[PDB]
Amino acid sequence: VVDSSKSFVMENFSSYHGTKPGYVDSIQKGIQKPDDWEGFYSTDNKYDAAGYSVDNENPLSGKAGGVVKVTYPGLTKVLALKVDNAETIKKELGLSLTEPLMEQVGTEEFIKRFGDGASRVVLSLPFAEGSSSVKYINNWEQAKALSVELEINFETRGKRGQDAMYEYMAQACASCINLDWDVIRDKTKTKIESLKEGPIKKMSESPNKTVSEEKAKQYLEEFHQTALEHPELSELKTVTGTNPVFAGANYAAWAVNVAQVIDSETADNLEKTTAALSILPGIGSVMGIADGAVHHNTEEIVAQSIALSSLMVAQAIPLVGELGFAAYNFVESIINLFQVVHNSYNRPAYSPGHKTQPFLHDGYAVSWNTVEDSIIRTGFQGESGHDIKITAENTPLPIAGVLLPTIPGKLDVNKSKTHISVNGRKIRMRCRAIDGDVTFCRPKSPVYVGNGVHANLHVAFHRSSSEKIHSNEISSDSIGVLGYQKKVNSKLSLFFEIKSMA
Amino acid sequence: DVVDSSKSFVMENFSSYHGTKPGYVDSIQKGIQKDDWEGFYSTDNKYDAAGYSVDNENPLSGKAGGVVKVTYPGLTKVLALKVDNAETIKKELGLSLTEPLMEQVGTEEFIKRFGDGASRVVLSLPFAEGSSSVKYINNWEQAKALSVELEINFETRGKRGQDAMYEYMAQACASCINLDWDVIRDKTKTKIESLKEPIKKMSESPNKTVSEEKAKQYLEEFHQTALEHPELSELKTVTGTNPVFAGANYAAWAVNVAQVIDSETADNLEKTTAALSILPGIGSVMGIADGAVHHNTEEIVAQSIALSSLMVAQAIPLVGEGFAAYNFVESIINLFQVVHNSYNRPAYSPGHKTQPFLHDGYAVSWNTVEDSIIRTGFQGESGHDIKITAENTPLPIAGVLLPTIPGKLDVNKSKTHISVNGRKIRMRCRAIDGDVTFCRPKSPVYVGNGVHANLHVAFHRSSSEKIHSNEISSDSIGVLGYQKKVNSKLSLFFEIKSMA
Lengths: 502, 500
Fold this sequence. Notes:
The structure is a homodimer.
Chain A: E1 8-11, E2 14-19, E3 40-43, H1 46-50, E4 66-71, E5 75-80, H2 86-92, H3 101-105, H4 108-114, E6 121-126, E7 134-138, E8 147-153, H5 154-157, H6 163-169, H7 181-196, H8 213-227, H9 234-239, H10 248-261, H11 264-267, H12 270-277, H13 283-287, E9 289-290, E10 293-294, H14 299-320, H15 329-346, E11 359-361, E12 364-368, E13 375-378, E14 382-392, E15 397-398, E16 401-405, E17 412-413, E18 419-422, E19 425-435, E20 438-443, E21 448-449, E22 455-463, E23 478-485, E24 489-495, E25 497-500
Parallel strand pairs in A: 5-6, 13-25
Antiparallel strand pairs in A: 1-5, 2-4, 3-7, 4-8, 6-7, 9-10, 11-12, 12-14, 14-22, 15-21, 16-20, 16-23, 17-22, 18-19, 18-22, 19-20, 23-24
Helix pairs in contact in A: 7-14, 8-10, 8-14, 10-14, 12-15
């Protein structure tokens, strides 16, 4: 129940607490309380703490308060727990099941049994799935001993929107998207104004009255085409000319969709505008985000995209809308959603086909069944097995075979234990070498997956030497599952890592 | 501990089944005759056994042999193991690691410590992922004691293709696709020749190589004309609405068939099957979409096969290199039987257990089997993890609809949250009525390629009283995607189970 490897005693133990606007100064005078888990919460990661700092009344678009650093004097036990069920924690630690867990954690008896000589216990738990951070749960009375220093006050930076918070969080990564949103906001304002002033003012050719969506989109695609000839949008024209996600039809679909959901009541409030915008599809077209990459990653190109998007919303509002919004609250709100998504891409994350993250392609979904399946262990003679889940979204799509790694004399496919099972039907495979480093295995009867029909590909590896695999030796870091043929096959990739035994 | 005692037992006259290739069905009944896993293999499921009975030289389309039942006299110990790693088995069972596991299994010394008084031990392992069958591994020497009875001989039935094998397997399910393929072959043959008698739109055909785009357009024209014929009238009706079954998909199928079939291929049923089996689009001809086999009558299946037969006939000139009525029909029938058999087998549907729900670009799933179970019969808390991502551009998650039971099952609003690439987002939860709470993220959630989320649902039970079926409307948690006014609905199906 206790993770010894995450538990330790520390002198001057410190941690971080996100603070709401209006408490950044008040909190520095001392931690005071305003069932089992009632307590003061903090984290070891100051950038995660900053995510708790935003106005409660306006959480999508409101002001961020700050981050403070709290320190205990003397010695503190960090007791790390392997479960977050208080009922289970109390039984397995054999203490009163009546009293709330965090009240007991502050009692002198508890601190004697678990403090290893420290003055107080702090509980430690995983911060979140996908995060290596921890959260700390402090007992409120013990929390009176904390000293509280300012780490950062975002309100004091005096920046627009939530820029201060997001610029701070971007420090965590030093591919990092680290954009100066002051510049972007200024360039955007400049570009909208300059674009509003020749061929553009295509406007006169506008129906300017509630028309049909299909006619509105036809017109907005023409407007988009004309708008992109302007020199202030020349780079955007170049970087948006090939990828179909960034095409005029998607700018137009976006603007139409925006105009259809923004009524007077929504346009008049930034929070309600952000909420409405945040549930629309297609924002990737304006952000330049496709295929796992943030392509618009310079202040200039972002401002260009936002400006063009602003103009187009302005043109779509007469054609489909109710209803100024386009250049004011729409720009503020969209900027917020950029920062959200950029932040997601900045954060460490496993990519498709790594660990248990699905690889989605051509209608298929494939994943390693468990994290350990994605690890090819090394340093021993013998056998391992690895399960790959496979299915598809709708109609029956075939699985032609699998490309597997081999290392001459050290890593081989075990041809009798490698197989694929379709809704439990076990299908044997015929494996043939392509070259010294790649074997191709084909199922001995046809495999189809689809809605309601899944497969388990079981790959078995044999090692003849106990010599560890070295980087040089391996060319691919993926197992390539082949789907239907189009002459090319649909390639479904499962990425593995070579590790020694633990 | 490697031995699962809940799956181990001693039995008198222990019996199991063995799939037998053509040519060995009679020979094998005279007796079972011959590193770690070397042994004689069988299964408790005769339908799974039947899947090992196809000609090893023509596994895709070859003839199926049979199934035999093998029985040990006296008492047999079935020793079920929780791992299939022989090196790990020998260590936890303290055995010679220089000696193969299945050799050790057949010795008096092994049979003493693990046999429980039985004359021999048979090893038992899970048959396959997604199956509740077991495979048995028999020591070759011990196996000489087996008597062998015929369960079924597929060649004796004297049917075409692998009809006998698949008709046997369909007995497993008594929805069940249990089609008479002799009828379908007969009806198919008669419709093809009846349609060759306005169809003969064949005159407008280039009759020489052209471009795909022209070929496809002419085949869409041929398909429309073909469908007016009275012998295909039920097909016209049932394919008129679902876009998977549209004429343009029949045309794309036929073109793709003509491009991969050369003369070597057309003249050999095995090679035709291998080539056809890697093409996309076959659901159009099969009438399979959205998790259902729609074409599930002998008449409608024959109409569909007849029509694509004619269309392949018309497409070979326009892009190609008699096949259409011969090996094409024999091959496509076999692929039909494969897929029908998959849909007949017990299987969790999308969003059940750890099967992903794929919809509108999103992919969502329960993180583990236990997450998909809401336990009942206690006061207290549980948590449940749902994985969420999407295939390409950023797509939003608006919220989640959660079940509630007034005064007995409640959302723990403090512990329910969502985390995006590790960023923890708190949720604002408000009841819609007394049975449904809606939770929305306090900061915007987007998923996409390289951005995923973990939705953590926390439930509080106020009562020790077990939930009763009546009390719960839904059987799913509804995760809401982007707005189109409705939201994209992503469903995660749960089961209520007692603690245990």
